Design a protein around this ligand. Structure first.
Ligand SMILES: NCCc1c[nH]c2ccc(O)cc12
Ligand SMILES: NCCc1c[nH]c2ccc(O)cc12
Ligand SMILES: NCCc1c[nH]c2ccc(O)cc12
Ligand SMILES: NCCc1c[nH]c2ccc(O)cc12
Ligand SMILES: NCCc1c[nH]c2ccc(O)cc12
Lengths: 386, 390, 388, 388, 388
């Protein structure tokens, strides 16, 4: 006679009105069951506050007019047809920026009761209120809000293909090799309503993810700690007014190097910044300050009575800063030497200064390094808590 | 029988001439109501002088031919049909650069009188004349001018869906997490005309936004304040003939260093610049002049190159100004040695008068560098007040 | 009866053959009037030698078939129809790189005689031979050459909607708030031809613009002037070698720091260089040569009087240019004098030393001349820029 | 009569139903033979973990309706027809990111029994789990998983055009002038089943490649080696800071500078570092600690008047290492005594120096060990790279 | 009666089967004459190894069905119709990356025998193996290979419109205001055959271009040459430890200031780099070493030189090296003579001087030698670039 698969298509698509919502009673809405499966997390631009992700999307609805009796058409039950030849809902995402990378699937499946199945990928670029308060130990929940732009709930309601529990624990396909880990895909339904006349169906998808901080645990924290811990020694083991300048220039050498390479690495939003960057500049600042101080006093007392103890108005301020922390010719010729190498007139003034002042920068550098070590474990715990 | 939507869709679109303006009297125009809702502010490139936005746009007009009696078609009043099957106006934005990200909504709603509704989003890239004069405390009104490119006022007028007051105080959806803040979306109608023959409709939308300057407040102002105050104790502690040079070149590095981290943070435009950068280099300018003038006095008079340095004609010209603002033969040889120990001991000349004039200028720049820091602090708060006023 | 617009569109588009050039005598061409209005200048990439602009474009031509009597259609004279339903010429810009930002206006107006007006925008990206020989004060003459790619003069000639004088002075819409300024849009017609058989029409629009130099005048020229004069006071009043060399090198650093912070915003193209960069490196070069000669003699002759009285040949040449520039007591006195022995010893060489030091003021004289030319060159650029 | 191609195309496309899968018994699937030919490797971003490539793709299937007896149509056996007029499978790649640079081929060949050969290029952008643990001597096998997005194995199975041996040894076209080298294209068939109801066909293509490490061998390894040896000789001869510290930190500058220059040379990812970057920071870190203890030694032994006496509980631990690792008259010369005392200087910490100075010799053993293993890895990396 | 174009366009396109190769005897091929005219070189990315160019393309073939007698249509011989209404071959460029910038021309010309003509532009982005060994004096031949993707030689052969001599030298349109100069566009026909069954046509176009090095010579060579010879003065005339440092310091600033500004300027490919980058780092490093070796000497000659008297084995080493290259009275005087010991430290330093001195007549010998080759290359590169 003729192939059933041609005998069926012409029976359906002929007298089919694409563009019309496929129902007989307009009062009845057509429902769309949704399924979302993550596949990858391509990029996270913390500056532009967006998220590039690749998911495997599918949905099904019902078409009253795409029905047939299989027994006539060689007992065929399923069928594939072009997607441009039938009605399709205007489902989208609210949180989108760019789209067009997602190709167009030119086919969909149909069953003899009107169930239409449409599979597709989605290269999405969404917006997300990202946070980098804890940069390496960062956790974020970005949302994908599926809905129809035009049709209301009286025409299009949205539901789920599967159970929610199957949607949360769905690691059946996901690239764990990337920077980010997947924890959950938590959905939620809502009846969106911005005004009175109309309401709209929404189906959210809270995409929770977690960073893999090990790379950053090494390249940042150990160098910072290895330098932070060693800058401490430059205050205590050696004396103020000494060659400890040699100890700090070399520290600052690698320290600035560390700041340079990492500034190329960690993000920099205008909305905020992480805390570890706050501790680096501090521990950089005091190093320069103590170094800028240490070079002065060796150079001040290097000379004898060249400038006498002029600024003795601030030693009053020093007073409780202590408390806060805690041959008759040959006669004169030979006497000219002990007169020469006596070093009390300017030294003692600016020396007691440098010592007591040194304990300040030391005692402060201790805590900036302390909090840097204290806060680090909390972010790990929170990162580990999830 | 058959269903209603099929009986209705064929009733309308059959013998429907898409491309024709949908009226019976051509003398009558076709108005289009408008509504705009700001969803987000995605990017503000102060260099290229553009703006990126996401808008939830809707409009409606009337189609005299898309009319029916609902009672025949099962009392159906509403309907959804494809957008490419009917006439649509050529509403566009003059202040546009890029389009293509905004997708196409294929469907539109229709009522039994002709009211066509078209909801859609708009990912826009507009051109806007910005100003970073008051860089952190910036406020900018960028305009969105909706109009038809071809059709005139006689064919297409433009109107508002809602009241203008509702449009301004519209924050039902907006991302307050982003860098910028929203204040108003002020509309305004105009009858644009550029020649004599034709006049065109316009409906503007002045989008007023405000920056969240807190992050920039600590990263640039506190450092700039930090460098400024310590430069000024550097004036009083050392007098001229001393270790000023110990401290100026110390801190001239700080301005030089700090001035780098702003050049990448601060948006590097070309039409203009903010005022803080002016105060940064102006404060650096004195930190050179106060340093250079200090060099020519101090290590010079100590060097004793000039035994008669003082110009009295010019020192007078200086002091004209300051007044307006304010064995026996061996028994001697030790004393001979002591003359050569006094050589080894110290030095002094008549340069103290010449050198006194070096002192007073340093204490005069104290009256200047202090001044520049003053206006830098005074100008700061009025910007905050303005930004706070909006 | 029935509406007129609906009754009319069937009268025209039915039996209408899109794709065919709309004339009755093929021997006659189809003229296309043109008009251009600038609206903004979006970007000028001196590196890639391109120009990004946004103009407002319109054109009209005559379609012999789109003709009707308005009396039979309710006295209606004008009509709007889609552009995809009619013939449209293949007008294009030759100096283009990328197009596609321009959206498509579907509708066009039609009159009862055949005039087919077509308004549209154009977001162009053209290729322009940009010159930054005079960077802050520069003027450019970029060309927008409109023509059909395929049809010849026998089918399509091109004219102007308006007069050229109106076109040049047209500034009804232009954003004067941007970086660049508009002066003129000069049109010009040509009969393009590259081989013998085929000739093609052309209408070039020479777009002249001008830069707003004030921002660059602040960021570059005053600091360069600022950093230049301090190298002059750092020469004369410190004739010494000790503090001179230090403060001179204190200057050469900030001289270099300024040299790079401008380099990021300075537009560097592989074709040519702006003159104000040429002056910075020359004044850097003399800042070094003056330093080289300075150290070449000082620590070798002055700080250590190593006996080098030999080179008077090397002063003969100098002497030319000076015309063309224009028992215990025995030991007590020993140690007592030994301190005086340890004082300075200005030998005859240190007198020879000073005749080489004379040229230190010659380089001063030359470095001064460089900074002078830096000023004379600037004003003539400002002047000619004012003339445009 | 009439042409054959014209008479033939009517015989087929008339009453043809594009969109229908071209078979008679739906129970039977339709197979798609596949072939892949590499042409170039264009870009490799280790940061974004993607890959850009250019391949020459072809495939064929069968169409039961596109059949004819060639004897009628002038013995014509082959034919070219457009792709838009016939059914086409929905074959794609799972590991895609962006596509659209690849153009569309508007023609397809067809034979007189249903074979439908479709050639096309593909400018792909694919994700790949890369690794730069062995940065210069790096190897990557990236996957190209071809499949249909919708249709199942029951409708569409996938097969190869050629044998896999032909596919692997296919360098008929490839640009060996690029940064990357090609080794193999290893295919593999699979049956994908994420769930129960449905199973899908797959045909992967493991694209194995190899870097050309020569340029990176020069710009990085020779300097790093050149920098490592020079810090070693600084540890043998000079025993104190005025002999040591002035030397080694001069290298710490260039060493640190070298660490900077490699970063902009290196590829920056976030999943894992190379190894050589570890040896650099380590040898840098070790260098710092040597510098650290060296200075504390100097302050107390060589500089101090009275120093921290010897606890020697720690020397008890350090010595265990060696077991494991191995009035006129005087008034005159009172001044001379003052001078003689001014010029002589010594303390007791020489004994306290010994326990400390040998730690220099101790850590010195490590700078060999690290710099040693720096080379040991670098050759097995070369070898395993060479073996591949 | 009726116009001719409407009477003609309906006579052809009615009963015209687009999608069919327009011939009567399928056994014949369909030739496609080709012509290529360069217009501009837009970009040359040495890093990504691509080439952005813009050409003016045209081709003509034969359509046996598009024929008419002009006498029956008002003696009309030519005609413009849409490209979308006729068969168009599948010509493409194999070595492309992305296309789509170029617009589509919706019209083509037709004559009364079948000679279809299709003018259009092309904004190409092709892959090319670019060498930058001779960076400023570069010469590069990139290939543009035109062919049909699907159709074979039996269906589509390719030829030229003009003679190759005309194509080889056609600067009738080209922008000589760019960085690159044009020399030749050499065509070449082949017959591609990757397998046994199918042979495909090809028409290559070797696009040979040349760089304009004048800008780079100023910005790179003269300063590098300038900062290559001033050091020689330091290397030669003063063996002094303090002065030579002060001189070598100043050069490092301008040299480092120079070395940065060139880095962004020149292209930094991964497969290779120009020779000019070699001598720079050499002349950079070798400056620091001399500056680094002097500071060792002065800091030890002055402070404490007799710690290590002189390592005689190293003395022997450098020795053979250059050899193969080539109670009151005198008690009062005792204190005075104590200062006569201050006249000059022990011979330990006089060898420690011989340590550092004799090097500088070698570091001089090598730096000058390195500067030699840097000058020798620059002229032979110029010669080749000039010969081309
Ligand atoms: N090739 C079918 C793979 C697959 C299984 N499940 C899916 C769900 C959605 C989708 O777009 C794709 C898929
Ligand atoms: N999904 C409909 C959300 C919505 C409510 N109001 C709107 C107005 C305009 C628009 O494009 C969209 C909307
Ligand atoms: N909305 C019409 C504005 C307008 C006035 N004149 C024009 C000329 C050309 C054009 O594309 C646009 C315009
Ligand atoms: N406007 C036609 C100019 C022209 C002359 N010759 C050509 C050859 C090819 C082409 O695309 C264009 C042209
Ligand atoms: N022009 C045909 C070249 C060629 C030979 N073999 C191929 C295989 C696939 C393909 O896309 C192209 C080709």
């Amino acid at each position: 006679t003729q192939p059933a698969l041609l005998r069926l298509s012409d029976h359906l698509l002929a007298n089919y009105k694409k563009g019309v919502r496929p129902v007989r009673d307009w009062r009845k809405p057509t429902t769309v069951s949704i399924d979302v499966i993550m596949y990858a997390i391509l990029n996270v631009d913390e500056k532009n506050q967006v998220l590039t992700t690749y998911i495997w999307y599918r949905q099904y609805w019902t078409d009253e007019f795409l029905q047939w009796t299989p027994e006539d058409f060689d007992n065929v039950t399923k069928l594939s047809i072009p997607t441009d030849s039938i009605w399709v809902p205007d489902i989208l995402i609210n949180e989108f920026v760019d789209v067009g990378k997602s190709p167009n699937i030119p086919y969909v499946y149909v069953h003899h009761r009107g169930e239409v199945q449409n599979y597709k990928p989605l290269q999405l670029v969404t917006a997300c209120s990202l946070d980098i308060y804890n940069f390496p130990f960062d956790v974020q929940n970005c949302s994908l809000t599926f809905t129809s732009w035009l049709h209301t709930i009286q025409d299009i309601n949205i539901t789920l293909w599967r159970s929610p529990e199957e949607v949360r624990s769905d690691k059946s396909i996901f690239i764990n090799q990337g920077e980010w880990e997947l924890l959950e895909v938590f959905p939620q339904f809502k009846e969106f309503s911005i005004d009175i006349s109309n309401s709209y169906a929404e189906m959210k998808f809270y995409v929770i993810i977690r960073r893999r901080p090990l790379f950053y645990a090494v390249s940042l924290l150990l160098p910072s700690i290895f330098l932070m811990v060693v800058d401490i020694v430059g205050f205590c083991l050696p004396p103020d007014s000494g060659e400890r300048v040699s100890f700090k220039i070399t520290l600052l050498l690698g320290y600035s190097v560390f700041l340079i390479i990492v500034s190329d690495t960690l993000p920099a939003t205008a909305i905020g910044t992480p805390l570890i960057g706050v501790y680096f500049v501090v521990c950089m600042a005091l190093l320069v300050i103590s170094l800028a101080e240490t070079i002065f006093i060796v150079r001040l007392v290097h000379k004898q009575d060249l400038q006498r103890p002029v600024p003795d108005w601030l030693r009053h301020l020093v007073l409780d800063r202590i408390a806060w922390i805690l041959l008759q010719e040959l006669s004169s010729i030979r006497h000219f030497l002990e007169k020469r190498d006596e070093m009390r007139e300017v030294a003692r003034d600016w020396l007691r200064v440098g010592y007591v002042l040194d304990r300040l920068l030391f005692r402060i550098y201790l805590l900036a390094v302390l909090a840097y070590s204290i806060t680090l474990v909390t972010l790990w715990s929170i990162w580990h808590s999830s």
